[PDB]
Write an enzyme that holds these catalytic residues in place. Structure first.
Site, PDB file in Angstrom:
ATOM      1  N   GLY A 196     -37.249  32.547 -12.277  1.00 41.38           N
ATOM      2  CA  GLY A 196     -36.793  33.644 -13.113  1.00 41.38           C
ATOM      3  C   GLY A 196     -37.774  34.780 -13.343  1.00 41.38           C
ATOM      4  N   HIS A 237     -32.385  41.146  -4.486  1.00 40.13           N
ATOM      5  CA  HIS A 237     -31.730  39.841  -4.456  1.00 40.13           C
ATOM      6  C   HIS A 237     -31.419  39.284  -5.849  1.00 40.13           C
ATOM      7  CE1 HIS A 237     -35.993  38.286  -4.617  1.00 40.13           C
ATOM      8  NE2 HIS A 237     -35.421  37.370  -5.381  1.00 40.13           N
ATOM      9  N   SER A 247     -39.006  36.697 -10.862  1.00 40.97           N
ATOM     10  CA  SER A 247     -38.926  37.652  -9.765  1.00 40.97           C
ATOM     11  C   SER A 247     -38.594  39.025 -10.338  1.00 40.97           C
ATOM     12  CB  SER A 247     -37.869  37.201  -8.749  1.00 40.97           C
ATOM     13  OG  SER A 247     -37.894  38.014  -7.588  1.00 40.97           O
ATOM     14  N   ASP A 265     -36.496  45.059  -0.451  1.00 39.72           N
ATOM     15  CA  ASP A 265     -35.981  44.208  -1.538  1.00 39.72           C
ATOM     16  C   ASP A 265     -36.185  44.881  -2.909  1.00 39.72           C
ATOM     17  OD1 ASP A 265     -34.724  41.910  -2.537  1.00 39.72           O
ATOM     18  OD2 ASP A 265     -36.588  40.788  -2.690  1.00 39.72           O
TER      19      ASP A 265
END
Ligand SMILES: *[C@](O)(C(N)=O)[C@H](CC1CCC1)NC(=O)[C@@H]1[C@@H]2[C@H](CN1C(=O)[C@@H](NC(=O)NC(C)(C)C)C(C)(C)C)C2(C)C
Ligand SMILES: [Zn+2]
Ligand SMILES: [Zn+2]
Lengths: 17, 152, 183, 22
Positions: free
Chosen positions: B110, B30, B112, B54
């Site tokens: 930020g 993502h 991730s 993901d």
């Protein structure tokens, strides 16, 4: 969709060198 | 001439983190998508892409060093933010962890794709997404290293 | 320090500067860190600074003096049986503190600055949660075994191996350090 | 005998840091 650029880095050990 | 394990990456719309574990530079789908990573020799494509978990990964870039997967099953995790802040986390489950002290969601923004380290600084998981109540991040979701090891 | 345990190494002397310094016994280099990579003419190992004393394995240091900015420094403690020696921690080094919590899960810091987990199996043993080749553990004698908090539990002494792969490590618990100082 | 010599160090006190862009 373009390109992911690295704008920086993190050294987990805190190595200054 | 230090080498980083965590690269602070960014696309046009956002910025996040990537973590080199076992020669691969991992990050969240993502964040990157199918996006290719920049190289001084031109765009280099993802070795792995996994929208389900993901997870996406390209070969580790330059100026990077790989993180070692956790091998002690400790539940006392530590999350590293894009600001190099370390946040103590207690593993609540396979891909869930509770912050020992909730922080405003902005604090984890930020980060991730970043790493969730065990007491030995080994990769336990990759920060997937913050789970917050109102404006405060109380817990975090994360991609276990096994998924990554599995994807390899 | 704290947690997570992360560490890095920095070489500060080459083979020739080392030999000269060994002989002259005078080392003017600046010191930093809690674990010093150390070498004699016969071998290289580690020395950990715990509570102001720089400890290492007797089977490595023997009764040698440590090269310092003021010439060779004599050992403060020597204990052939505990297999320990200690010199006043060099100026500039940072010391660790003994583990005041009896944690069962220990972390060994190798010469290559890798923190590998070991499970305590007794006062001086711990199973290497991830078996490594003996070659990898070489040079780490005298290194610290930290508890999750970053405190000294023991100093790596010998490897428990078979077929060249170590599955456990024998260590000198900080307890022997104190008894070695009392002796 | 020959003195034990310090040829390097291992620092445990380091904490994660953004490698300076210099
Ligand atoms: C350190 O002194 C060093 N040079 O770094 C060294 C580390 C080992 C880890 C691989 C090399 N330790 C020794 O060499 C240690 C010293 C001798 C015998 N040693 C061993 O580790 C041997 N194992 C061993 O004796 N195991 C026990 C004690 C039976 C459990 C090796 C066969 C692995 C060298 C002494 C004095 C114990
Ligand atoms: Zn671990
Ligand atoms: Zn402790």
């Amino acid at each position: 969709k373009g390109s992911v650029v690295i704008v920086g880095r993190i050294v987990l050990s805190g190595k200054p060198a | 001439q230090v080498e980083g394990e965590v690269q602070i990456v960014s696309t046009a719309t956002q910025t996040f983190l990537a973590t080199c574990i076992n020669g691969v530079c991992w990050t969240v789908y993502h964040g990157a998508g199918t996006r290719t990573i920049a190289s001084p020799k031109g765009p280099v494509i993802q070795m792995y892409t996994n929208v389900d978990q993901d997870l996406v990964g390209w070969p580790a870039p330059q100026g990077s060093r790989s993180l070692t997967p956790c091998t002690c099953g400790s539940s006392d995790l530590y999350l590293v933010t894009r600001h190099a802040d370390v946040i103590p986390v207690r593993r609540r489950g396979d891909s869930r962890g509770s912050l020992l002290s909730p922080r405003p969601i902005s604090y984890l923004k930020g980060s991730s794709g970043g790493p969730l380290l065990c007491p030995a600084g080994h990769a336990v998981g990759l920060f997937r997404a913050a789970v917050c109540t109102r404006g405060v991040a109380k817990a975090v979701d994360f991609i276990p290293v096994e998924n990554l090891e599995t994807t390899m």
